[PDB]
Design a protein around this ligand. Structure first.
Ligand code: HEM
Ligand SMILES: CC/C=C/C/C=C/C/C=C/C/C=C/C/C=C/CCCC(=O)O
Length: 419
């Protein structure tokens, strides 16, 4: 088992970012390697379809307790679905999956569409529009409503900012950092607000619609016959829409892709099924999740080495989505590649891999793709706009992935045939 040197390589991982793991595989000439991080903890980095298949074998890999605690404290919440494994996890995961009906998915589609259409005037009136910011505010509107949570309009900008702080809080991979305290306080504010809504729902003082997250989470009973305690219930209720709001990252990246590859715009407009392919390709190509932590429960034989019991595991998300053998030209943006993708659970893993129901794989992938379809269709078809000189760099050596400027547009004008 080959190794990246030192006693602790955390600073080096942060310096190389999304390119760390691939830099190490190239220079060490291997598909699998160990490194130490987060204070001398050994992690074996696995990649590709075989890496993802093993990482999602529950007989042999633990996820519980493996997330850095500071990231639990800011991004997910204590006792969240991401923190639990086994029967308890499967049971609670089914509640999340139960929201993803045909009707509820068709509703998030309609909400996204209506709100972009309703936002056109505002964007015309602005001197410039930072798409990262504008989209995070619009998606807070979409997400709170889809989840059955009432958010007064005066509070939407605050809530969006709080979510943004939480979403960004994996940047130090669990280390201390300047905004850590502010990040916890943002989370507290959002948990308190949601707990109040769960309490008032259970008390019968408010009446969210049946099939909404707030309704279904407030009333659900676990497999032993118990509802969640109200704080846990608020924490997991946030997990139904904070990551929806995080789609703003992908909205910024999608406008970037359309600007860099103007042929895509035309095809999103003219071509059936293309908005779907474009959305998939934003998720594959652009950086968001670098890797995911786990632990070997037992010795594991893998690609010619033995991973000892008790050692950490890191599934390389960026590496897999950018694997030369899986995608032919992994560093080119080419939506047509999805004409031949066979739907594997183990290659297109930007929001995880494996099985939705028994693994920690994202419950929100359909929603992500639907929002990205409708949002890219809007920007491609419904408005024209200019793109000013600005800093469009996406620095692959810096976690998290952002367009430096946020992606700014100007001179927004609705497309209307008035003849
Ligand atoms: C915006 C981009 C999104 C990204 C990058 C993202 C990424 C991910 C990742 C990496 C995981 C963990 C996979 C694992 O641990 O094996 C995950 C889990 C999760 N995602 Fe997402 N996701 C996004 C959007 C959404 C949306 C829109 C929702 C809900 C509407 C959602 C709900 C969740 C839930 C509930 C889990 C936990 C499932 C579990 O622990 O079993 N995600 N997501
Ligand atoms: C080379 C490695 C050492 C690995 C160390 C382990 C680091 C843990 C990294 C966890 C990063 C998880 C980021 C996931 C972000 C989910 C999308 C955001 C949506 C949401 O708000 O939940």
């Amino acid at each position: 088992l080959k190794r990246d040197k030192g006693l602790d390589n955390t600073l080096k991982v942060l310096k190389q970012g999304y390119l760390y793991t691939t830099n190490q595989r190239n220079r060490l000439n291997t598909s699998v390697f160990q490194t130490k991080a987060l204070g001398g903890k050994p992690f074996v980095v696995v990649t590709g379809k075989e890496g993802a298949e093993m990482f999602y074998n529950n007989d042999v890999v633990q996820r519980e307790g493996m997330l850095p605690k500071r990231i639990v404290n800011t991004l997910f919440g204590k006792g969240a679905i991401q923190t639990v494994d086994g029967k308890k996890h499967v049971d609670r995961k089914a509640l999340f999956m139960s929201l993803m009906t045909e009707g509820n998915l068709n509703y998030v589609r309609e909400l996204t569409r209506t709100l972009w259409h309703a936002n056109t005037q505002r964007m015309e009136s602005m001197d410039e529009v930072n798409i990262y910011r504008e989209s995070i505010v619009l998606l807070t509107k979409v997400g709170t409503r889809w989840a059955g949570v009432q958010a007064p309009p005066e509070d939407i900008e605050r809530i969006a900012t709080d979510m943004d702080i939480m979403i960004d809080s994996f940047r130090a991979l669990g280390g201390a950092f300047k905004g850590y305290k502010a990040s916890k306080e943002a989370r507290r504010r959002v948990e308190d607000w949601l707990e109040e809504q769960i309490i008032e729902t259970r008390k019968g003082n408010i009446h969210p619609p049946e099939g909404t997250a707030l309704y279904e989470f407030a009333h659900w009973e676990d497999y032993l016959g118990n509802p969640m305690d109200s704080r846990t219930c608020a924490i997991d209720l946030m997990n139904t829409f904070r990551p929806l709001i995080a789609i703003n990252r992908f909205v910024s990246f999608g406008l970037h892709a359309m600007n860099e590859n103007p042929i895509t715009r035309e095809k999103i407009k003219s071509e059936p099924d293309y908005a779907y392919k474009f959305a998939q390709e934003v998720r594959r190509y652009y950086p968001f999740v670098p890797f995911l932590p786990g632990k070997a429960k037992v010795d594991i034989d893998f690609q010619g080495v033995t991973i000892p019991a008790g050692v950490g595991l890191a599934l390389d998300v960026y590496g897999t989505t950018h694997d030369e053998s899986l995608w032919d030209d992994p560093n080119e943006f080419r939506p047509e590649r999805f004409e031949t993708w066979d739907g594997s659970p183990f290659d297109l893993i930007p929001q995880g891999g494996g099985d939705y129901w028994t693994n920690h794989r994202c419950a929100g992938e359909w929603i992500t793709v639907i929002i990205m379809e409708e949002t890219m269709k809007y920007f491609a078809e419904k408005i024209t706009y200019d793109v000013p000189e600005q800093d469009l760099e996406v620095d692959l050596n810096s976690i998290p992935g952002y367009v430096k400027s946020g992606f700014v547009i100007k001179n927004v004008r609705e497309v209307v045939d008035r003849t």
